[model samples]
Target: NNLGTELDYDTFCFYYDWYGSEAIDGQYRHWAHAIAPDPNGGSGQNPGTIPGTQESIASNFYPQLGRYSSSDPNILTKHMDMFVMARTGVLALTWWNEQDETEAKRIGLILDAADKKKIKVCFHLEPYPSRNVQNLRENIVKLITRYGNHPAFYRKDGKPLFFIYDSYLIEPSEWEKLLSPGGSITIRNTAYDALMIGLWTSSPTVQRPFILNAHFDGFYTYFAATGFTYGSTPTNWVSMQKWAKENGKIFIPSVGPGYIDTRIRPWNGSVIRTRTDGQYYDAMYRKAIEAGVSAISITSFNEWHEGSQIEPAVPYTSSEFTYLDYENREPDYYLTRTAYWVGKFRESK
Candidate 1:
């Protein structure tokens, strides 16, 4: 059961502040923090708005819990405890660029904490980083040396797991280097488990080559209505399933309840018209079963501004569509139905 929830650092803080101790109702579960390389500083664009000549982007938008510069134990411990208590299994650390001295120390602290608590860590490799392999290898070696033995490092079939943002943007040679023993310049850690490739776009032409390469253990194709232009369709989804089966790799389908990006950006793309309250979700549920996916990742549990958020909101229940003014009576109506179908499918299989 790949029931996962992804959140940005700021949003994670918000969740902890608002409902950290709240009961796990049918409407919510735990949250996963997507720690990116740098904060976007309110500018929702690649390269972000942080100004500097440094190779990596700096986060200036959200306030840090404390001086990340000094590697404040209080800040680190608080954030770590928040995630740990949330039952978070994966910490998707942002590793597009090499970490500076301060950042590296802070991360080491996090690794140590995760080790003690037994939490898995996966580094996020931005697709287009300069000196990509060298930089990535440098960081990987540092991580392995420090925490490779930690029980928290994700392992599939006994190997550490790594993740890439976009498979299409990566070079085949670079990927091979990361996977091959000689390429990594260390004891080939074939003990490292699986690699996950992320795809936010819908171009099969680009997607096909990745399927052909067969380097990754699974493909995480984005299915949120906010990030993507198209909604779930029979043909499109079937094609994805077919490709996954043919490649002998598991496909983790992503689904979003709905989305609204009003607070972040004012552009026309912000308006989410793709899925209604119950309509598209039903389609996604059926597709997951038919596709034989090992797990299904919900786009989010608490991205409130993005209409897809599964988090309960004021004046609206899970089944009620605020935009359409449709209500289903039960407050957690949608979540209950989702659980029902997921259980039914798993049992049948």
Candidate 2:
């Protein structure tokens, strides 16, 4: 680790998109997603888009490392070092499922690399195709059996942790079967039991019932855009924290340096949050800390699609559009700044 020490356990950073560069995997996977606007004037989720050319990748910002493969051992080591420099101890890596042998193997490698750095890795459960209560149960067992013994598999006390993204896609009643202690398929008291942290992406009132009904151990705002959802808005965190305490649930408010995804979804301009040199990050971190939460999740380490990455980025310009740059700050500015905020967070405790 760059700092030669781990950050506080309360710090986590979302990690994503392992596929990159044709040199490693013989395919430019995620980085090649087409940036064409949706034909129906919506976000580009349609099937008609073509693959992006090498020079015209999907993201609005360019990575300092260029188009490198994430699964490479050297890249993984560098990534862990950067996270340590930011004082981030936990990596919430996006997980689809174990069905994909390639992805599963990559995750194992990721865990091994993180372990070497004394960093912990937790699952960020993505809403994979046909995801349901039954599938979730089976996948959890499979995932735990596969990597539970690894030292890098993040756990709190004795229970492993999972941050379920877009968890609302499955109704609370269904989730209750797995999470509720008294429910039919409950994992409680089982070897595979875990601390399920669901996403709170709806209005504050609407999310409360879901969290309770689903028997989630905690909740987190996953979106990077402030005001994009009630949970993502830092101003709402104080009340959320109070309610969480009253209900005996953990409330982890996610903070981001900023947000922008126009390159991937051209129609989504209204939600763009300017980085404002580094003030935006400072303000958001301050809000999350002031709200009095024990744990804080950074929106991302390298979710470049939304331009919410704290990972280093360099200036790039093309005739089409100039990618956003850090505006006079060094490439590692966010990393240094994150370490500062994390120190403040540690002091708060």
Candidate 3:
């Protein structure tokens, strides 16, 4: 029998902000994301926490690592080990551009650690400052030149894969200049040609017309909130998958444990989805598998502010607020649950 499980090459998880810690950088980066004022006439406004003596961060759930820095080789090793146990095959590192030297260096460190554990790393291309299709093309070339040769850089069928967040920000006509086959600056069949996957954020009733002309190899549902958008609603995945298969496009359904960003965005409370122990994850996983997808992506591995991470979380209370945690479950509960669902999907495949 083969040693590896089925679908090993097709599973992915989003990894974020692991390098943003005061211990490594001398100042908090993502951990100090500002919180918005109360929507009620700004009656109650908390600018955000500073990780004071009481130990408060900008997340609703406290991390088991207690604001650890990803620059630490040991922490990166431990996370790679955790991903192996969780059956996560690939980690989509949140990336802006190659110009950010610190982020680029962190990605290098992460790549080495991931290589040691036999895991793969890919890029989640974020919409950066002054972003446009022309510069995006340049950035892709920069990234590919910098780390594309690394063993840990993820690739399939001899091509790298990229997930473009909020890809619809640019007009499809603009994207065509880079992604389309016959366009002036098309990347297809070039050294930088890759499996480009964009986000689907349309409503159920309306088809996103951009997806048709954008020339993306595939599309994924990035939001963790169920019913938040047509793509995020699991029930709509079947139809989406049908459309994808008919058009020879891959449909990667992304599942998440839950979502709660109250710590950073206190006013946006209505859309929070409770984890329900682990039911939310299970149900979403089941729907994705039932849809007969070619690949599955987890909404996040450690997006703390969004509270959609599968990373370990522990109960903790601060003078200002008490954080939510995996009730009645250990810190590694979500990781174990992830393995279970991944095993089920493997067997089904």
Candidate 4:
């Protein structure tokens, strides 16, 4: 009964990246995410007017400490509380291999914080070196054996959900062996049974035409920039939703606040989307709802490197650069809008 509608879906997960610790020291993080103060300021940005982007910034949004370390208890509280207020309650945390202690600790922190706030936690499996179905199967078993009991681990119909980003790299037959109900190494009927979501890029090739053949229970389009790929283009959503339902599958569309990756992918700087204040975010939400999909995925929570983070970035600058802010609006503008949209989506449904 949040806002005006009764709570519905169980997996409205946000893609949460936790590799933002360096920004906390008032310094930059990735060389790819660093903005230089000396570059071309008024030298004329690209036409179509999206703006240059590449590195993380203290000035990207409203609260500078907003991108604070995930380990920061206050930051965790702020994020979860904001999510609660928005009524978007799931987080699909970014993860690398198992040995990364920083990510592991942060995952623990999110689980704890989300647990208290009644939020759910899921994993967005990144494309690590040598990741295959076998390894992923093992990962799933461990995921359930280890964290299955936690109140925050997101599960649907008694099975946890594993969001496999960049899943097209694997062969469909390979994924079939892992995801098919009759998979050679099927996770079904075991304690490890879980919902696997493969990604559907715009130009999915024969190797990965759609998630249906991959044997995945469902699929998602993770990029926030619309029309970036045929799969993610908004116009394609209604048809895809129909395909998923007729095929007995689920569809999760990922929406975002904005997109810009110039710092690292300068060659691909042409790919940028204006925040347009907050209209961009709301439009994406409305599309997902209109598509009549089962659930939606938020493109990111704090991926500051690409300017896609909804986490509150504040007005600040380094010796060499000025960061992006919320047009000098209150730090919680997006948060408030998110709540508004959630209610709207629910009420509209």
- lDDT by residue (1-349, candidate 1, tens digit) is 3553321111111111111111211211112122232343455645323221121112111111211222445544554554544343455554545455645665666667656655556565555456465666666566666667766565555655555555556675666666544554332544333454545355777666654553556566544563353324434666676777887766666665555543233343534644455676666667766766655555543343354544333332222122222244233444445445545455545
> How many steric clashes between backbone atoms does each model show?
12, 0, 0, 17
What's each prediction's TM-score?
Answer: 0.57, 0.94, 0.94, 0.85
Worst 10 contiguous positions by lDDT, candidate 3: 45-54
RMSD (CA, Å), each prediction: 10.4, 2.5, 2.2, 5.5
Candidate 2, which ten residues in sequence have the lowest lDDT sum? 44-53
Q: List the global CA lDDT of all models.
A: 0.47, 0.86, 0.84, 0.71
lDDT of 3 by residue, 1-349 (tens): 5554423668899998444566677666666666776666455554655453336787889888877777777788889988987888899999876466677678888999988878999999998887888898888888889889999999989889999999878888888899999878898989999999988888633445677788888999999989888789998998999888988888888999999998777777887999998999899999999998878999889999899999999999878778899998889998888888888778776
Which candidate comes out best when scored by TM-score?
2
| Cand. 2 Cα-lDDT | 0.86
Looking at candidate 1, the ten consecutive residues that score lowest on lDDT are 7-16
* Model 4 weakest lDDT span, ten residues long: 47-56
User: Candidate 4 on 229-268: residue-level lDDT in tens?
Assistant: 8766878888888877887878888888888765544545
Candidate 1 global TM-score: 0.57
Clashing pairs in 2: none
